[PDB]
């Protein structure tokens, strides 16, 4: 008798219990310890290397483990793989579809991913012996736009797409091994922990859900935001992660705490974030707001360590190397400014 | 060595730069188009009536040696707040509106709120909208027969008359002209509500004749880049 009503009432009671359990272990906040650590200061970073080769707006990028080559996607049908050290476009992949929204550099530098409104996550071989690059595998299992994707190895990658479901793909068989379902809004981004065993994924329903790559289920759910979580990136520690949504406020959640630690709010900004990643130490949170600027926030002092000039359009993608050497920001002006 | 691999890298970068400079002229020539509607509003008929032509994602045509990239989204999900931001460098957001499906749900209002969301978007505010009032031939028998009246879905139609700058069609009753041009003026009300000058709506009626429709897109897109360049030089 009225299974929907009673089951939704039970779900609301469970959500209230989750909130009470979160506030029970929340007797303080991350700000209560800012008096113990010293800030970094207003560090103004300049563009050491600029990458002006794209024909359309740059929507996605990703860094390699070598911290030298970086891939970037734009709506011109081209995928440009630059060498950030000497400023040379190592590769130019002609994409099947112009509008692409995701980028993922393989942990071995041998593969790369794509995807957009075509709903196809075209993998490409980088160090292939055939000379130019070619399509490695056409991952066609998503009913919506491919928002973001990450690489786990040269065999399996994960893709968070706009079909409210993430999928751990497999480059060998070309089929989804597991499918992470549970998001109510179209997913917008995702990130992998340094351990690579579990990954977090931010969607448009303000839910930064944490899934486990081994079991394929939903480990934790972080509904602490207020709008579409356009960007999300796991802390270098592996137990926390920052999330930049459309509400112009970034939120730092923690896995073991299962709640929000800090809110990087500011009255001067009213436009949401679309690109977020952490530095090598995680103290600096690079957040690409929609105001043509990028804010380096002090992830432990709850204040912005510096605003970046440069980009004239919306900065849509951001990437910090695995050693934190330099942060590459790609905006909608077909430019990639590499700050350091 | 010191320059052995760097010279090859620079040669590859030069080849990639040549390829990108060759493709930049193409990207500037192929004016991408966003074809969308409030659902089954006749976009499939627009794709069919375009150069007589992986499901339905992107269709390309070319008129007067000017190619276009009409991207359809008939395979995406319901929510449009994110994948529509990818059409920020797009030339024209061709809004195929069903001018006769206002009865069914109120698909007309569904198109208005989407057009209002496209107009007042933070990224689609610099892109004009080619308003394609599809199913105009269906509208002819929808308002005259009394089966579907704008009054049941819009009260402003009672206080609305045919404008002085209207172009009637031979064999079309003024009640249809008053109804059809109300759909244009209703979308144009949202189009002129912003008044930013960076983008203007281009209301056009289609689906009545099976003639070439890509000319209606070419002649609109020509005026789109015209007013885009006019606004660039402050001549508009």
């Amino acid at each position, epitope marked *: 008798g009225s299974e929907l009503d009673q089951l939704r009432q039970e779900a609301e009671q469970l959500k209230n219990q989750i909130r009470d359990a979160r506030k029970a272990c929340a007797d303080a906040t991350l700000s209560q310890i800012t008096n113990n650590i010293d800030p970094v200061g207003r560090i103004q970073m300049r563009t050491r290397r600029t990458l002006r080769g794209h024909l359309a707006k740059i929507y996605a990028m990703h860094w390699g483990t070598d911290s030298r080559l970086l891939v970037s996607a734009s709506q011109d049908g081209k995928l440009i793989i630059w060498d950030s050290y000497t400023t040379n476009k190592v590769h130019a992949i002609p994409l099947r579809s112009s509008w692409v929204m995701t980028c993922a550099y393989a942990p071995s530098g041998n593969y790369v991913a794509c995807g957009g409104l075509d709903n196809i996550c075209s993998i490409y071989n980088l160090k292939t012996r055939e000379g130019n690059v070619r399509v490695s595998r056409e991952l066609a299992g998503h009913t919506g736009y491919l928002s973001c994707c990450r690489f786990l190895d040269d065999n399996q990658i994960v893709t968070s797409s706009g079909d409210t479901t993430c999928a751990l793909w497999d480059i060998e068989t070309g089929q989804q091994t597991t499918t992470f379902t549970g998001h109510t*809004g179209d997913v917008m981004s995702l990130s992998l922990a340094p351990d690579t065993r579990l990954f977090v994924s931010g969607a448009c329903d303000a839910s930064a859900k944490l899934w486990d790559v081994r079991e394929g289920m939903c480990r934790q759910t972080f509904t602490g*935001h207020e*709008s579409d979580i356009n960007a999300i990136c796991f802390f270098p520690n592996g137990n926390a992660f920052a999330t930049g949504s459309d*509400d112009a406020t970034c939120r730092l959640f923690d896995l073991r705490a299962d709640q929000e630690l800090m809110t990087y709010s500011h009255d001067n900004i009213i436009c949401g974030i679309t690109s977020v990643s952490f530095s090598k130490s995680g103290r600096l949170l690079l957040a690409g707001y929609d105001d043509f600027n990028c804010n380096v926030w002090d992830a432990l002092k709850a204040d912005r360590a510096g605003v970046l000039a440069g980009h004239d359009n919306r900065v849509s993608c951001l990437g910090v190397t695995d050693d934190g050497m330099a942060v590459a920001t790609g905006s909608w002006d077909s430019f990639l400014k590499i700050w350091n | 060595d010191q320059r052995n691999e760097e010279k090859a890298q620079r040669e590859a970068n030069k080849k990639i730069e040549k390829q990108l400079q060759k493709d930049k002229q193409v990207y500037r020539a192929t004016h991408r188009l966003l074809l969308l509607g409030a659902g089954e509003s006749g976009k499939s008929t627009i794709v069919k009536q375009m150069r007589i032509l992986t499901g339905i994602f992107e269709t390309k045509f070319q008129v007067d040696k000017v190619n276009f990239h009409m991207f359809d989204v008939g395979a995406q999900r319901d*929510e449009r707040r994110k994948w529509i931001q990818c059409f920020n460098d797009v030339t024209a957001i061709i809004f195929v509106v069903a001018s006769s499906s206002y009865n069914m749900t109120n698909r007309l209002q569904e198109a208005l709120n989407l057009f209002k969301s496209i107009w007042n978007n933070r990224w689609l505010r610099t892109i004009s909208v080619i308003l394609f009032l599809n199913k105009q031939d269906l509208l002819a028998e929808k308002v005259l027969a009394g089966k579907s009246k704008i009054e049941d879905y819009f009260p402003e139609f009672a206080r609305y008359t045919t404008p002085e700058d209207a172009t009637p069609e031979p064999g079309e009753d003024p009640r249809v002209t008053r109804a059809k041009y109300f759909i244009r003026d209703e979308f144009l009300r949202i189009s002129t509500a912003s008044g930013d000058g960076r983008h203007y709506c281009y209301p056009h009626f289609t689906c009545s004749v099976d003639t070439e429709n890509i000319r209606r897109v070419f002649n609109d897109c020509r005026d789109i880049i015209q007013r885009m360049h006019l606004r660039q030089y402050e001549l508009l």
Partner: nanobody
């Protein structure tokens, strides 16, 4: 946690009055373009009314234009929908569909179900 509880509604006589109170908790109510979107039984979700971030850009759909009245209250973070002169066609489940992005005027909640910021809804039905 973004949650919207739209209390009110029920089985009322057509042509009377009703008040839907959307308690919207979990976000800054004074920054999102709150709006009401109804779904008729058997039909899709149809946008009903909308209000700006402060209460200036007030708009309703043609089916309820002039009859309904939307009003935001940023002091208590509540959206009120005063339905006047009800219609036999107004029987539907009304959701407190919030605008996706704050400080903007574009809302994409007019689409189909499974929307992000959309409450459980209130089955506002009319009598016969």
């Amino acid at each position: 946690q973004v949650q919207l509880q739209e209390s009110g509604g029920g089985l009322v006589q057509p042509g009377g009055s009703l008040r839907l109170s959307c308690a919207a908790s979990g976000f800054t109510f004074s920054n999102y373009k709150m709006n009401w979107v109804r779904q008729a039984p058997g039909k899709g979700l149809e946008w009903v009314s909308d209000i700006s971030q402060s209460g200036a850009s007030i708009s309703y759909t043609g089916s309820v234009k002039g009859r309904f009245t939307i009003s935001r209250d940023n002091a208590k973070n509540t959206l009120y929908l005063q339905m006047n002169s009800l219609k036999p066609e107004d029987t539907a489940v009304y959701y407190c569909a919030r605008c996706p992005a704050p400080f903007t005027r574009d809302c994409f909640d007019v689409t189909s179900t499974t929307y992000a910021y959309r409450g459980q809804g209130t089955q506002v039905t009319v009598s016969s």
